[PDB]
Design a protein around this ligand. Structure first.
Ligand SMILES: NS(=O)(=O)c1c(F)c(F)cc(F)c1NC1CCCCCCC1
Ligand SMILES: [Zn+2]
Length: 257
């Protein structure tokens, strides 16, 4: 099936998902100097105080933390967004070395990892339905650079040994996603897509300017995960990122300057 390898990775996806060569594909290189400040962007509101994490799982492509999105908790609103978007999961993409791993790039810079907090437009009632619509999802993307540790990430890192292989999961309650946010909410925004199959062009990307710092020990724990299931041939879960795609006719806006 699809994956991140030589024979099934990003260059191959368009065969099963022709939208791979579409007009709004993600990620992209963000040129910080041609990003257009947009005064009509409203203040960005990240309201995570009532977030309810449920479970963490290894799906064979990454790991994800699932939230209870059945109520009006953990919402993103404002910025470029119309209406209210509810948090449903977060996940990461990372590299086999610190010099790569992010999907978005900033003036060509690759970060060691990228965090995606995935929200769905409450007009659509759930995340699956939302993903079929052009305005269906908003993804808050945060870069991870290697340096000092992120204490708020440690709960995640410390359970990863329990979900090493595809199809493992564990209960994962009371994880506070506020602990993964940098100080600044300055951001870039552009219209795009899922970065994995089916590559739907349903995402309003919101990419924060300020990375978070994580430690080498934290990122090393990501790299001990496996794409395979237990009892199958070992393949380390590393380099699960799609490279930058053409911007085409789109404009990237900035919330600042
Ligand atoms: N990359 S993304 O663009 O934020 C994203 C979404 F917005 C989403 F709605 C659903 C998605 F599957 C993804 N990508 C995967 C990426 C990693 C392997 C599997 C874990 C789930 C997330
Ligand atoms: Zn992602």
């Amino acid at each position: 099936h699809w994956g991140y390898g030589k024979h099934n990775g990003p260059e191959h996806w368009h065969k099963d998902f022709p939208i791979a060569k579409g007009e709004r594909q993600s990620p992209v290189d963000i040129d910080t100097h041609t990003a257009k400040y947009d005064p009509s962007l409203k203040p960005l509101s990240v309201s995570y105080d009532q977030a309810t994490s449920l479970r963490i799982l290894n799906n064979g492509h990454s790991f994800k933390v699932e939230f209870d999105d059945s109520q009006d908790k953990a919402v993103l609103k404002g910025g470029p967004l119309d209406g209210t978007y509810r948090l449903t999961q977060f996940h990461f993409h990372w590299g086999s070395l610190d010099g790569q791993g992010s999907e978005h790039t900033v003036d060509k810079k690759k970060y060691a990892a990228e965090l995606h907090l995935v929200h769905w437009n409450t007009k659509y009632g759930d995340a699956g339905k939302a993903s079929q619509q052009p305005d269906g999802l908003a993804v808050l993307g945060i870069f991870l650079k290697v340096g000092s540790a992120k204490p708020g990430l440690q709960k995640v890192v410390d359970v990863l040994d329990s979900i090493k292989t595809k199809g493992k999961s564990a209960d994962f309650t009371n994880f506070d996603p506020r602990g993964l946010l940098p100080e600044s909410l300055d951001y870039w925004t552009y219209p795009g897509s899922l970065t994995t199959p089916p590559l739907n062009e349903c995402v309003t990307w919101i990419v924060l300017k300020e990375p978070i710092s994580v430690s080498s020990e934290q990122v090393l724990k990501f790299r001990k995960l496996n794409f395979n299931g237990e009892g199958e041939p070992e393949e380390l879960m590393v380099d699960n990122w799609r490279p930058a795609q053409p911007l085409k006719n789109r404009q990237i806006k900035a919330s600042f300057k």
